Amino acid sequence: RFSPYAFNGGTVLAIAGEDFSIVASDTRLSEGFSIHTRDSPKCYKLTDKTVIGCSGFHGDCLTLTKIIEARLKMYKHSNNKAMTTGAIAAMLSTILYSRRFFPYYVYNIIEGLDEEGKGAVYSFDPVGSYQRDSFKAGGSASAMLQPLLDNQVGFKNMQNVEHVPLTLDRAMRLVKDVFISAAERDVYTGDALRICIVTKEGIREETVPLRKD
Amino acid sequence: MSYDRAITVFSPDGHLFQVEYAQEAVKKGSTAVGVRGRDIVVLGVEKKSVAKLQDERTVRKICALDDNVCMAFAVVASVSGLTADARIVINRARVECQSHRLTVGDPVTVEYITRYIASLKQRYTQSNGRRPFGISALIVGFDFDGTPRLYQTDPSGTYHAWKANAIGRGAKSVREFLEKNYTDDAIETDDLTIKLVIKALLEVVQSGGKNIELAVMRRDQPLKILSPEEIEKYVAEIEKEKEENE
Amino acid sequence: MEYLIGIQGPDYVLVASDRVAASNIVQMKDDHDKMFKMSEKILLLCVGEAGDTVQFAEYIQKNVQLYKMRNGYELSPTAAANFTRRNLADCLRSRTPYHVNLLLAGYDEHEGPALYYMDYLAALAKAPFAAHGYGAFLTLSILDRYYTPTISRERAVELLRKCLEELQKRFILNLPTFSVRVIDKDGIHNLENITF
Amino acid sequence: DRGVNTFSPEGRLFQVEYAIEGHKLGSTAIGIQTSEGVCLAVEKRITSPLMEPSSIEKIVEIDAHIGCAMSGLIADAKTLIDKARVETQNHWFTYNETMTVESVTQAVSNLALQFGEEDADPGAMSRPFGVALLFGGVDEKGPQLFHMDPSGTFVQCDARAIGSASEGAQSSLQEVYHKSTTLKEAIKSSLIILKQVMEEKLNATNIELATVQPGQNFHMFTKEELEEVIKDI
Amino acid sequence: MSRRYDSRTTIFSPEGRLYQVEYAMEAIGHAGTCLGILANDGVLLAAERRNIHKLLDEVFFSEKIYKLNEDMACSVAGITSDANVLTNELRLIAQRYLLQYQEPIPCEQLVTALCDIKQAYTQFGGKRPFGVSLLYIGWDKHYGFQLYQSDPSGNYGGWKATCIGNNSAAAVSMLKQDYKEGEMTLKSALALAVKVLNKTMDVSKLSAEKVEIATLTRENGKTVIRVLKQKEVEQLIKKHEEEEAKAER
Amino acid sequence: TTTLAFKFQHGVIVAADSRATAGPYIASQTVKKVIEINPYLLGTMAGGAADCSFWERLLARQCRIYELRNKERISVAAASKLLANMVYQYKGMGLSMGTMICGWDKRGPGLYYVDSEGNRISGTAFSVGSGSVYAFGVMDRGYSYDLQVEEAYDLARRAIYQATYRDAYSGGAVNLYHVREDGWIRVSSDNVADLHDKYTS
Amino acid sequence: NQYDNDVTVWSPQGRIHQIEYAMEAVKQGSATVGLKSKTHAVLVALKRAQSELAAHQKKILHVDNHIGISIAGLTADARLLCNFMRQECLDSRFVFDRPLPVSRLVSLIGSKTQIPTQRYGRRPYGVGLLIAGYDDMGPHVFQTCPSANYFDCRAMSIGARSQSARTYLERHMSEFMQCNLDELVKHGLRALRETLPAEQDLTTKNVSIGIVGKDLEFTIYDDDDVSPFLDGLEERPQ
Amino acid sequence: MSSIGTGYDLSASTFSPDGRVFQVEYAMKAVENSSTAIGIRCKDGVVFGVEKLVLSKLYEEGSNKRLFNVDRHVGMAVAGLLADARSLADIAREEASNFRSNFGYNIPLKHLADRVAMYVHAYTLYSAVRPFGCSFMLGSYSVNDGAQLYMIDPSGVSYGYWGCAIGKARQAAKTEIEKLQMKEMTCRDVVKEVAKIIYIVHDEVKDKAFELELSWVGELTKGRHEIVPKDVREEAEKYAKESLK
Amino acid sequence: TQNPMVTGTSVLGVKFDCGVVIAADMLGSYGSLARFRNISRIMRVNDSTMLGASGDYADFQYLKQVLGQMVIDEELFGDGHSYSPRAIHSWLTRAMYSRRSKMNPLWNTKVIGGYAGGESFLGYVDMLGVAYEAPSLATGYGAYLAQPLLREVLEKQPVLSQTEARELVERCMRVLYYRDARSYNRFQVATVTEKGVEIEGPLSAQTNWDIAHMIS
C-alpha cells in the first residue's frame, strides 16, 4: 500500500474512540494531494445508511471506494434481516473486500463506528489489507502512530496509569479527540482547514465544526 | 411436438417423466449385492455377461473408484449385457474421486462419493436434454475412519445407508431375501460376510461360481478380487442350505 | 548447487534409494521425519526429488492419476510407458509461474518390458541408466558408480559405497547426518532401511 | 418444437398445481421454533430396520449453524440445498455472525419458477421444485424457522408441520405444541406429530432428529444420540 | 409404451430405455459382414465394402478398413458416411495415446476413449445415434493379439473371435465354431476368413471388388498394418474357391 | 519452525500459541492486535509473518472445512482439512507470504497433526512454527523437549520461551496467547503478558 | 389453453392468452393498496396465511431501505423479482452512490419482464408488483403487471378484489397530495377494507404496513407493530 | 382461409403456402386492439399525436409509455400492445447507443430505419423469441438529412412517410392526413394539425375514451424529444375539439 | 499523488455556482505541448437540455468522455417523456472509471466539472483524475486548482459566497495571472453559462492583456 503515483498520498487522519455508550469520531475536512490542499470542502466522514457512520481516511478516492463497498453490504444484510445492523457488519464486509484485492490492496482505512446489532456501541477497525480486531481506542491512517500513544497510555494501561487506570470516560474521550486534532496540525503537514467531529449515539449523528488554522 | 413427448412437463404424477422412468429400471441384467462386515465390506456380482471367450478384464461389473470405495450395479434396458452406460458413470465417478484426493487428502469416504453420484444424476434433471442415469450402485467401502459403511444410491438420486442391500433381477425380491440371511453375527465374522453376498445371488444362479465374482476391500487398501476359482468353494457347500428356505 | 543431496544405487534388479528428510524453509528443518518418496502404487514406486513444493505437489497429483489408470486397463501401469509418461508431465508443468522441475527416479517391475530404472535430468531429459544422484550430487553419485563397480555388484557392498557418499554430504554440502530416509524398492514393494 | 410453461385456464401454472401433488408422495418435515433452538424432525420413510438411522440425507446443513429439512421429492431437495448452501457459506465467511434464515428462504423460492429449456436457456431447469422446505437455524435476532412450498410462498413461522397430508400434519401440531415452552418439549411435539402423518408407529430407526440451538448449533445425530430424544415420545 | 417420447435425443424415451439402439443393431445386419480372426503371428480383419460395382477408381484400398495407427487398425460394419468423422477421430486418439505412454497401444484403451463420444451423443447434444459396429484389431505385449467389439451404444468386449453383420446371431456362433485356438497361422486364418465370410453373405462366388482384406502382422517386434490391394486379395479368395466350388451342384 | 507462533505435537493436548504482537511489522495497527483466532471449533492453527497472510488462510479454511462437513454430515480427516489449506496458500504465495499453518484436529487413527507449509508440503513433524523468527527460538524449548508433553509441562514450556525471548529478542511483545485443545474442544488457557512472564520466569 | 402451452401460437384476436392467464393469478393473490402523497409513499397490504400457528405472511418486502414492494400473484415469480431488484439497488449505490430512482428501476424491470413473454413457451411473470418508493424526486407508486406495460400512478391497488378499493381511490384523488403520513395511512386502510366482505373489517394480524417518505426510511411493520398507524376505522358499504 | 390460428404457428420456424407466415399477420392484429398513433412530418421536425387510452384518473406522466425518447433527436410514438412496446424501444435505442459512441454524430434516419427493420424481422425468423406485435414510428430532426419520418410495422417493413398513422384506424386516418397540408409548415402550426386528425378519425368501434398526448421533436425544442407543454397542448386540443364539431 | 505529462491540455476551467445558473469560463487555447495549435476551442459540451459539462486538463481524455456520457444520458431519458439525468450518478460512475485508470500507471488526467439539475436540486459535481465527488462553492480544477483556487479560497474564507460583480473582477484579474504564471494558455476565454434549456456559450474571444511587469 503506497501512493506516490498509483494511489493518492492525500494525507488525512480519523481517530475514533469507543467508551461503552458513545463513539466520538474526529477527522479533518481538507482534501489534498501531497502537502497542498486541493479544496477546502468535503468531510472525510460519510454516513453509509443513517444508522451507521464510517470514517474513511488516507487518499480521498480510496475513501469513496471503500464507503461504496461498506454501503452496498450494509443495506443487503438490513434488507435480509428486516432489522438494522451496524458497526460489526462494516468491519466484517471489509474482510471480503480485502480478499478481493489480494494482489495489490487499497490504501484506505475505514473504521465503522456506530452501534452493532449484537449490542453496545462499537468503533471497529478493519485495515484495507485484511485483518479485523476490536480496539479499546484507535486512531488509524498514515499518521496512525500519533493517536496510538494517547490511547495506549490511557485505555490499555499496560504498566501505565493515566486519568483513571481503566478505559477512559465519555467526558475525557471527547476532550482527547479534540486535543489530538490540534497537535496533529503542528506536527504533520497534511492536516489543515477545519476539524469536524461527529459524535454517534448509535442511530444518529451530530456534527460540530472547529477551525484550527 | 406433443406436450407429453417433451422433456419439460411435470405431469399429473407430480414428478418429472424422465426421472420417474429411470427408477422403474433397476431390476433385470446383472445382480449386485453388498453386505457390511467389520473387516471387509464385500460386494459380489453375478453375470459379467461372459461367454468365457470374452475377456473378463474388459467388463467390470465390480470396479474400484477409490482405494477404499468400490461399486457394483445392475440395470434394465434394450440390448443385453450393455457395458456403455455403466462405463461412463465409472469413468466420471472414478476421476472425481482421484481429483478429491488431490484437493483434500487420504482415501475419500464412502458417503461422500455416494453423495456426489446421487447429485450427479440429479443435476441432469435441470440440465438441457439430459435424463438421469437409471443406475443404482451399491457403494461398498470403508471410510478413512475405518467405520464400515454400505450405501446405495437410487436413479433419482436419493441415497440411504443400509447394513446390507441387494439390487437387480427384481430389486425388491433380492432386498427381501437378504434380510432373512442378515444377522448381527454375520457382520462380525470374516467367513460369513462373503457367504451373505453369495446367498442373495444364488436365487438367480447361472453357471457356477465362476460366473459370480467377489471382491473384498479393506480400510485404506485397494480392491482385491478373489479368484473366480475361490468363489466356487463357497457355492458348492452353501447352495444346498439355500434350497430349503424358499 | 542445484538441490540438496540424493544418492541412488541400482543393484541390477533391486534399486536402493535415499534422500534426506530435511525439508528446510528459512533456515530450519520444518520436517525432518517424513518421506517425500511416494507410493504411486505397489508394483510401481516413484521417488520425487527437487524443491520443497514441486516434490509434494507433482507426486500427489501423479499418484491419484496412477490409480485411475489401473482401473481402466485392469493391469498395473506399464514401466516403459511410465518412463516416457513422466517426461511429458515434467516438460508441460515446467513453464508454470511456480517452478516445477523434478530429478525423478521411476522404479517398477513390469511383466511387459521388464524392470526399469530411469535417470532423469534437470533439463527434462529422459534416459534409462543405472546409477543416479539428486541435487549437484548427481555428478557426485554417478561418478563412484562408474569406477568402483561395473554397476552389477551386490546391494550390501553398494550400501558401503552409500556410507562413503553420505560422508561427502557432510563435507561438500551443508546437510547434516542426523536423518536420511532410506528405502529399497524391488518387485514386492518398499522396504524401510535404517536411518543415518 | 414446443414451449416449456403452460398456464391452465384457472389462471395458474399447470406444472405448479402438479408440484403440490408432488409433496403428498414423500417424507414429512416438522419444525418447532423456540427461543432456545429450532428442531427439525423428519422420517426417512422406512421399509427395513437394515436401513441405518445413523447418517441419512433428509436434514442437511445449509450452514454450520443452519439445518434444513425437506419433504416432497427428497432427491430434488438436495440440489435446492446445494444452491442455498453455496450462498450461505460465502455469507458466513464474510459476516462471521449469522446468515439470516429468511434470506435463504427468499433465495430458494427463486428456483421454484425460473425453468426454461427448448430455445430459452440450457442453465435453467425443465421442472418445477415439488420440494417444500423447513429452514431452521439460529440467527442474531433469535432462532428462526421459515417455510417454503412449491408455489414459492415464503412465510415466517413460529411453528409449522408439513407432510404427506398438509392438513393432517398441522392439525396434530394444534393439539400438541404451544409456541412458548422448553426446548425439550419442542422435540417432544415434533415426534408425536411425525408419527401421526406416518403409516407406522414411532421407532429410533424410522426417524432422524437434528436440533439447531444457539447453544450447540447444528448436530447431525447418530444412533446412540437418537435413543436419548426418543425417550420423550 | 403406446408412443415414443423420443423424436430427439434432447428429449427422451417413454420408458427411459432407448429404442434407437435396437434399430442400430439391425442396421449392422443390413450392411455387410465384418469378421476378425486371431492368429499366432498376426490378426486379420475381413470386411465387405459398400462398393460392389465394377467401376471402381481404386486409389483407396481403404474404404471400410482404415489403418488408424502404427499399432492398430479398425473396420466398419454399418453406414460408411459415419466412419469418416470416426476414422479421423481415431487417428487423433491413437497418436494421443502414444504421445504420453509411447507403448504399443492396447486395444482396450483405444476403444474406451471412443466409447466416451458415442455414449454422449445418445444422451444429449441432439446428435443422432451411431449405426456402425467397429472391430478394432491391434497388438500389445501384455496379453498379445487382440480383437475388440464396439457397439453404437458404447458397449464393449474383448474377444479373440467375433463377427457382426449379415445376421449377427448366426455369424458370431459360426465364426467361433470354425475358429480354433493355438492351432493357427496367418495364412490359414486368412483362407478360413474368406470361407466364413462366404457363408454368412448370400454370394457363393465373392470377389476383391466385393471384399477388402487387411492384415495386421507383427514383424521384428513391431506391428505393420496394411490394408491389402486387389491382386493379393484375389489370391486368398481362389484358395477358398476350390472348396466352395465342390459344395455347389 | 519459524516466528512467535508455535505448535508442537503430543497425544495429551496440543498447545497452540501466538502473541498479540509478534512484530508482523515494525508497529501496531491500533493499541491491540490479535493473531490468536479460531473461526472453527475443533481445529487449531499457527500462523505468523505478515498481518494479512495468517488472517486470509484461516478465514479461507473456515469455509472450506464446513463445506465438506455440511454435505457429508460427519467431520472430515485432519489431513483433508490441511491439504485444503495447503493448496490455497500456494495460490497466495508470492503476493504476501511467509505464512504456514500447523494443523491439529481428530482423524481416524486418533488425534492428528499435519503441518502445511507455504510451499506445498503436507508433512507431520515434532514441532513446527509458523512465520520467520523461531530460527532464533529453537534451543531453549529444544533442550527441555520430549515427544509427549503433559498439560502441566506444556504451559511451563511456552511461559519460559517468551521470558528468555524478551532478553535475546524483542519482537516478542504485548501479550502471550495460550490456547489448549483437547482434541476437538479448545479452551483459552491463560492470556499472560510477555513482560509479566519475564518477571516470574 | 393452446396459445399458452407455447407462445408462438398467436390468437385469432391477435393478443397472447399466456399474458391474460397470467393476469388471473394476480386476481387470486393478496389485495394491496399503494398510495403516495408528495412527500411520502405508503404500502398497505393484506397478509394471507396457511397456518395460524405460523406467523402471517409479510407482504411488505425490503428491496432497499428506500424502495419496497407489495406483491400480488405468484409468490415464486415475486421472490425472483425481489432478489433481482435488490441486487439492482446494491449496484446503484455501488457504482452511482445514491438512493436508486424508482423511475430507473421500473423501466429496467419492464425491459426484463418483456424478454421471457417473448421467449418460446416461457412465462411473463404472473405477478403484479406495486413498488412504493421515495427517492430524490419524491414519491412514486409504480405498477408492473404481467404485461411489460407499466403505469405511473398516484394511487392504485392490485390483487384480489382490489377494484372495490380502486373506486374509493378515485373519490379521494384530491385528498392524497394534501394528506400527511398519518392521514394517507387511514385512507389506505379505507381502501383495503373494501376488498374484504361487508361482514367484516381489518384486524392487526392480517395487516402489514410499509412506510417510506421524508419522515423515515423504509421500515417494514409486522404482526403487531402496525398498531400506531392502524387506528382509523371508516365505512364499508353493503 | 388465408390464415390458420392452430397449425403453422406451433413454432416460429414456419412458412405458409402464400409466402407469409400467419404469426406476422396476427402481429398486425395486435396493433389493431390499441388506439391510434399519428405522426406527421414537417421539414423543421416531426410532430406526434397519440391518443392514450385511460381507465383511471390517478394516472400521471410516464404511464402507458406512448412516447419514448430514443435519442436526443430521435422521438418514437407507438401503437399497439404496450408489453411489446418496451422491447421495440430497447431495440431502436441500443442500436442508437452503439452508434453514438463509435460514429460520434447524429444518426441519419435513412440508415436507422433499415438497420432497425433488420432486427424486427430477425425475431420473426427465430423461434428463440416470438415476432413483435406492436408497431412504431421514428421521427427525427437532424442536420443529417433533415426531418424524416419512417414507420416500421411488426413484420419488419420500413417505408417513408410525410404522414403515417398506425392503429386500428390507420387506413381511415392516412387518407385523412393526405387531404390536409403539414408537409412544408412548421412544428408550431403542425401540432394543432396532429390533434384534429385524431378527433375526426376517432370512432367508437375502433377506439375508447382517451386523454391526448402530443410530442415535439424539432427546431423549437432544439433537436430533442420533449412532450408538448400543457398550455400548448390545450391550445392544440382546443382546435381539435372545435374541428370535430 | 499524480499528474502525467500532458500533451494536448486545456489548462483551466473556471466555475462559480450561483442561484439558478452557473457561470463557467473555459480557456479558448489548446496547447499541444508548448505550441498552441488551436484557439477556437470550447471544452464545454452539451449532453442534454438541462445538463452541461466543462473539463480542464487533457482534451483527448475529454472527447472520449463526452460520447460516453452521451450514451449514459440517452439510456436514462428513454424512461420518461422529458426526464433529464441528475449530475451525481453520471459523475460518480465516471469517478470509479478514473480511480481504476489512475492505478494503471500510464494514463492521462482530466478533471471535469458537471452542472445539472435532474433531481429537485441543482447539483454541482466533479469527477477528477484522482476521483472524488463533492460540492463546492466556487471551483476550479487542474491548473486553476493549484494557483487561482487558493486565491478563491482566500476570498471564500471570511465570505462564503461572493457577489456577481466581485466574481467578474476576479475573472478579469485571473486571466492575466494565468497567462503570466502558466504557459500553455492564453488570455482568451469563452463565457459559457448552462441553464434549463441547454448550454449557451459562443466562441472564445480575446479579453484583457498584460504580460508586462515592466510597469510593475
If 0-12 CB within 10 Å is exposed, 13-18 middle and 19+ buried, where does residue C168 land? middle
> In 3D, which of A14, A27, A16, A12 has the Cα closest to residue A173?
A16
Sheet of F111-117: strand order equals: F101-106, F111-117, F121-123
Residue type, E25: M
DSSP assignments along chain E, one per residue: --S-S-SSSSS--SSSS-HHHHHHHHHHHHSPPEEEEE-SSEEEEEEE-S--SS----S-S-SSEE--SSSEEEEEES-HHHHHHHHHHHHHHHHHHHHHH-S---HHHHHHHHHHHHHHHHHSSS-PPP--EEEEEEEETTTEEEEEEE-TTS-EEEESSEEESSSHHHHHHHHHHH--SSS--HHHHHHHHHHHHHHHSS-SS--TTTEEEEEEEEETTEEEEEEPPHHHHHHHHHHHHHHHHHH--
Our CA dihedral for I199, I200, I206, I211, rounded to 10 degrees, sits at -30
Provide, as residue numbers in chain D, all residues whose Cβ is less than 8 Å from the Cβ of H128.
Answer: 119-120
- Residue D3: closest C-alpha in chain H: H11
The domain over range A2-213 is classified in CATH as 3.60.20.10: yes
Nearest to I119 among G96, G97, G136 (CB): G136
Grid cell listed for C7: 544418492
The H-or-E segment that residue G92 falls in is: helix G75-95
Q: Does residue E122 contact residue E18 with C-beta atoms inside 8 Å?
A: yes
Give exposure, H178-209, as e/b (b: 16+ Cβ within 10 Å): eeeebeeebbbebbbbbbbbbbebbeeebbee
Chains touching chain B at 3 or more Cβ pairs under 8 angstroms? C, D, E, F
Please state the domain count of chain F. 1
CA D80 to chain CA centroid, Å, is 11
Q: Does residue A72 contact residue G94 with C-beta atoms inside 8 Å?
A: yes
Is B245 strand, coil or helix?
Answer: helix
Residue type, B115: R
Is H177 strand, coil or helix?
Answer: helix
Cα(D150)–Cα(G75) distance, rounded to whole angstroms?
10
List of domains in chain B: 2-239 (3.60.20.10)
CA distance C18 to chain E (A): 27
As a 3-state breakdown, chain G gives helix, strand, coil percent values, each rounded to 5, of 35, 25, 40
Grid cell listed for I36: 498552441
DSSP assignments along D96-161, one per residue: SS---HHHHHHHHHHHHS----SSS-SSS-SS---EEEEEEEE-SS-EEEEEE-TT---EEESEEE
Nearest to D2 among B6, B129, B163 (CB): B6
Sheet of H134-140: strand order equals: H67-69, H74-80, H134-140, H148-152, H158-160
Please state the domain count of chain D. 1
Provide, as residue numbers in chain F, all residues whose Cβ is less than 8 Å from the Cβ of A1.
Answer: none
Gap sites in chain G (C to N > 2.5 Å), preceding residue numbers: none
Nearest to A79 among G64, G91, G94 (CB): G64
Is F30 strand, coil or helix?
Answer: coil
> In 3D, which of C16, C20, C3, C11 has the Cα closest to residue C137?
C3
Cα(D209)–Cα(D187) distance, rounded to whole angstroms?
8
Interface mutation vs chain I, best among H72, H74, H78, H94, most I CBs within 10 Å: H72
Whether the CB of C85 is below 8 Å from some CB of chain E: the reply is yes
**Any idea what the CATH number is for the domain that residue G11 is in?**
3.60.20.10
Please state the domain count of chain H. 1
> In 3D, which of B87, B96, B29 has the Cα closest to residue B69?
B96
As a 3-state breakdown, chain H gives helix, strand, coil percent values, each rounded to 5, of 35, 25, 40
A-proximal residues of I, 103-132, CB under 8 Å: 103, 105, 128, 130-132
Provide, as residue numbers in chain G, all residues whose Cβ is less than 8 Å from the Cβ of H130.
Answer: 7-8, 10, 16, 118-120
Q: Which fold has domain E19-247?
A: Glutamine Phosphoribosylpyrophosphate, subunit 1, domain 1 (3.60.20)
Distances (CA, A) of H84 to A93, C34, G19, H130, H133: 42, 71, 12, 11, 6
Interface mutation vs chain E, best among C84, C92, C93, C116, most E CBs within 10 Å: C84
Cα(A68)–Cα(A63) distance, rounded to whole angstroms?
9
Cα(H197)–Cα(H40) distance, rounded to whole angstroms?
10
Grid cell listed for C23: 525439508
Alpha-carbon torsion (A115, A121, A123, A126), positive or negative: negative
- Residue H126: closest C-alpha in chain D: D119
Sequence-distant (≥ 6) Cβ neighbours of residue E188 within 8 angstroms? none
CA distance C36 to chain F (A): 9
Query: If DSSP states are collapsed to H, E and C, what string results for I52-71?
Result: EEEEEEEHHHHHHHHHHHHH
> In 3D, which of F6, F4, F15 has the Cα closest to residue F151?
F15
Cα(E166)–Cα(E34) distance, rounded to whole angstroms?
9
CA distance D125 to chain A (A): 26
Count how many Cα atoms sit within 13 Å of the Cα of residue H99 in the half-sphere of its side chain: 21
- Residue C92: closest C-alpha in chain E: E100
Is I148 strand, coil or helix?
Answer: helix
Q: Does residue H170 contact residue H32 with C-beta atoms inside 8 Å?
A: no
- First vs last C-alpha separation in chain A: 30
- Residue G104: closest C-alpha in chain H: H62
Sequence-distant (≥ 6) Cβ neighbours of residue H192 within 8 angstroms? H235, H236, H239, H240
> With touching defined as 3+ CB pairs under 8 A, do chains B and D touch?
yes
Nearest to H101 among I67, I77, I81 (CB): I67
Distances (CA, A) of B195 to B57, B191, G91, I13: 24, 7, 65, 94
Grid cell listed for F15: 498447545
- First vs last C-alpha separation in chain E: 50
Q: Does residue I131 contact residue I96 with C-beta atoms inside 8 Å?
A: yes
Cα(F72)–Cα(F66) distance, rounded to whole angstroms?
10
Active site residue I1: yes
Whether the CB of D156 is below 8 Å from some CB of chain A: the reply is no
If 0-12 CB within 10 Å is exposed, 13-18 middle and 19+ buried, where does residue E1 land? exposed
Say what angle helices I87-103 and I59-78 make with each other, to 10 degrees.
Answer: 140
If 0-12 CB within 10 Å is exposed, 13-18 middle and 19+ buried, where does residue C192 land? exposed
Q: Does residue G192 contact residue G70 with C-beta atoms inside 8 Å?
A: no
Grid cell listed for H86: 418496451
H-type helices in chain I, by residue range?
59-78, 87-103, 143-146, 148-156, 164-181
**Could you tell me which residues are beta bridge partners of residue D157?**
D145
Angle at I198 between CA I194 and CA I204, to 5 degrees: 60
If 0-12 CB within 10 Å is exposed, 13-18 middle and 19+ buried, where does residue E51 land? middle
H-type helices in H82-215, by residue range?
82-102, 109-125, 170-179, 187-201
Cα(E75)–Cα(E43) distance, rounded to whole angstroms?
13
The H-or-E segment that residue D66 falls in is: strand D66-72
Contact (CB<8Å) A82/G93: no
Contact (CB<8Å) D141/A81: yes
Whether the CB of B146 is below 8 Å from some CB of chain F: the reply is yes
Whether the CB of F74 is below 8 Å from some CB of chain D: the reply is yes
As a 3-state breakdown, chain A gives helix, strand, coil percent values, each rounded to 5, of 30, 30, 40
Cα(G200)–Cα(C131) distance, rounded to whole angstroms?
99
Provide, as residue numbers in chain G, all residues whose Cβ is less than 8 Å from the Cβ of I74.
Answer: none
Cα(A95)–Cα(I98) distance, rounded to whole angstroms?
25
Q: Does residue G90 contact residue A71 with C-beta atoms inside 8 Å?
A: no
Cα(H36)–Cα(H78) distance, rounded to whole angstroms?
9
Sequence-distant (≥ 6) Cβ neighbours of residue C53 within 8 angstroms? C98, F90, F117, F119, F120, F121
C-proximal residues of E, 83-102, CB under 8 Å: 99-102
Contact (CB<8Å) B105/F72: no
List of domains in chain C: 1-196 (3.60.20.10)
Contacts within 8 Å (CB) and 24+ apart, C106-109 = C106/C44, C106/C46, C106/C79, C106/C82, C107/C15, C107/C17, C107/C44, C107/C45, C107/C46, C107/C47, C107/C185, C108/C43, C108/C44, C108/C45, C108/C76, C108/C77, C108/C79, C108/C82, C109/C43, C109/C79, C109/C186, C109/C187
Cα(H85)–Cα(D169) distance, rounded to whole angstroms?
48
> In 3D, which of E181, E226, E239, E171 has the Cα closest to residue E39?
E181
Residue H92: CB atoms within 10 A of its CB come to 25
> With touching defined as 3+ CB pairs under 8 A, do chains C and F touch?
yes
Cα(A72)–Cα(G65) distance, rounded to whole angstroms?
11
D23: which DSSP letter?
G
- Residue H22: closest C-alpha in chain G: G10
> In 3D, which of H32, H36, H31, H40 has the Cα closest to residue H178?
H40
Residue A106: CB atoms within 10 A of its CB come to 25
Nearest to B12 among D18, D25, D127 (CB): D18
Provide, as residue numbers in chain E, all residues whose Cβ is less than 8 Å from the Cβ of C73.
Answer: 106, 108-109
Q: Does residue E238 contact residue E231 with C-beta atoms inside 8 Å?
A: no
Resolution limit, Å: 12.8
Q: Is F168 annotated as a binding residue?
A: no
Distances (CA, A) of E102 to B155, C122, C125, H18, I9: 40, 21, 15, 64, 65
Sequence-distant (≥ 6) Cβ neighbours of residue B143 within 8 angstroms? B68, B109, B110, B111, B149, F108
D69: which DSSP letter?
E
G173: which DSSP letter?
T
H34: which DSSP letter?
S
The residues of A whose Cβ lies within 8 A of any Cβ of D are 73, 77, 80-83, 88-89, 92-93, 95-96, 117-118
Residue G1's domain comprises 1-234
Nearest to C68 among B58, B60, B94 (CB): B94
Chains touching chain A at 3 or more Cβ pairs under 8 angstroms? D, F, G, I
- Residue B81: closest C-alpha in chain E: E155
Cα(D144)–Cα(D134) distance, rounded to whole angstroms?
10
- The CATH class for the domain spanning I1-212 reads alpha beta
> In 3D, which of D58, D78, D53, D7 has the Cα closest to residue D163?
D58
Residue type, E177: Q
Count how many Cα atoms sit within 13 Å of the Cα of residue E152 in the half-sphere of its side chain: 26
